[PDB]
Design a protein around this ligand. Structure first.
Ligand SMILES: Cc1cnc(Nc2ccc(OCCN3CCCC3)cc2)nc1Nc1cccc(S(=O)(=O)NC(C)(C)C)c1
Length: 388
């Protein structure tokens, strides 16, 4: 039997990721409804989110496999409700950091939400149902951004009612998430029958470098998707010029889907390709960051974000395909959790040095030059690897 938990899971993935006010969030924080300047959003509230995704990574992962995946989705729905009720009714540098704290706990519970597929479905339908759930979530976010563009850019709806629609969507998601079946078995703790268990997978000289590049690229993309909407707000003000953020992020998610669909059908020989395309797409990423930083037109910044997100989705799907060649079921999520923790340590150190208020207190313009130099160092490491 594989019908009804898949149906309820896909309906929650549809009505949970269908959130319209995600591209139009950074004008809502600095608009006439919330008196917040750009520096108070850039250097004070957002990096706390990263803190809430570091400190709440390891215990919530313990909450992933111990209570067997139902209370973590119930907590994710409650966190949806609290997050959007405090977005509609929170003003200040305290309540918005509470919003970012609960959204970091949302992002922590999302990883537990990915692992519900492999623990309620029979093993004849792992990859098919997992790809269907990922496609439903991505298409739900795409349709939500398209609906936001149709309601804001054409139908002329305010942002407050857009967050009201987002609250109604996550409330319907909570009502769908309460009706989930409890799995009696788990993956690690209550499964069917460290100090000396970690050395076996990490006794390599290839998978270590691929996981390290996965970690650096994940930290870089997390910071770029943190501050790319503030870059959009800086290159074009939300109250002065007409901004088209919903359509651009919809086309960006669609292009990431097209990039993943293109990676899923690569019948190209892997003799010289493993040391050829990585350097080229790294130069493309550095040039996209430099094109978004050295420009003044907002349209060039949208195009640079499109090219950068498509190239990152392509490279990261190649990375997930190459790391998960000789991995088991449990070791998949375990090694990805360890690599996610390493990526978050790197992101935390880089955010405290570059972005955080207790420190340099840098504006949003200099930070994109910093991350361009970051990906330039990554491209130089791939160039030195290609010379070998
Ligand atoms: C409702 C909300 C509350 N707080 C925030 N702050 C925030 C802004 C940008 C962030 O960048 C990281 C985005 N995702 C990338 C991987 C997990 C998190 C993380 C947090 N954003 C929010 N909306 C949001 C803004 C940008 C991206 C996203 S997303 O994570 O849902 N992007 C997709 C998963 C759809 C690709 C969501």
């Amino acid at each position: 039997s594989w019908i009804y938990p898949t149906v309820i899971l896909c309906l929650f993935g549809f009505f949970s990721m269908m959130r319209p006010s995600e591209p139009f969030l950074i004008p809502y924080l600095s608009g006439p409804d919330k008196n917040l300047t750009s520096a108070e959003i850039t250097n004070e509230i957002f990096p706390v989110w990263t803190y809430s995704y570091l400190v709440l990574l390891l215990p919530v992962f313990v909450l992933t496999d111990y209570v067997r995946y139902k209370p973590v989705i119930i907590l994710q729905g409650i966190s949806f409700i609290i997050t959007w009720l405090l977005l509609l009714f929170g003003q200040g540098v305290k309540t918005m950091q509470v919003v970012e704290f609960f959204y970091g706990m949302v992002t922590a519970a999302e990883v537990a939400y990915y692992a519900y597929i492999y623990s309620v479905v029979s093993p004849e339908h792992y990859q098919r149902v997992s790809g269907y759930c990922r496609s439903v979530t991505l298409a739900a976010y795409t349709a939500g951004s398209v609906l936001a563009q149709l309601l804001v850019s054409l139908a002329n709806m305010s942002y407050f009612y857009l967050n009201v629609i987002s609250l109604a969507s996550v409330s319907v998601a909570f009502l769908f998430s309460l009706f989930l079946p409890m799995p009696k078995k788990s993956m690690f703790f209550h499964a069917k029958p460290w100090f000396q268990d970690l050395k076996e997978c990490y006794s390599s000289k290839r998978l270590f470098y691929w996981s390290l590049w996965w970690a650096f690229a994940t930290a870089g993309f997390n910071q770029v998707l943190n501050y790319v909407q503030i870059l959009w707000d800086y290159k074009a003000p939300s109250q002065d010029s007409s901004i088209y953020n919903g359509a651009v992020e919809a086309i960006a998610t669609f292009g990431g889907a097209v990039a993943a669909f293109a990676v899923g059908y690569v019948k190209v020989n892997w003799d010289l390709l493993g040391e050829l395309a990585l350097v080229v797409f790294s130069v493309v990423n550095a040039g996209s960051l430099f094109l978004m930083h050295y420009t003044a037109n907002i349209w060039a910044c949208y195009a640079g974000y499109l090219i950068f997100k498509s190239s990152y989705m392509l490279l990261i799907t190649i990375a997930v395909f190459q790391i998960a060649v000789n991995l088991n079921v449990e070791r998949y999520a375990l090694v990805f959790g360890i690599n996610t923790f390493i990526a978050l340590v790197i992101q935390t150190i880089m955010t405290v040095i570059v972005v955080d208020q207790r420190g340099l207190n840098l504006p949003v313009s200099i930070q994109f030059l910093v991350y361009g130099s970051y990906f330039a160092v990554i491209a130089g490491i791939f160039l030195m690897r290609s010379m070998y």
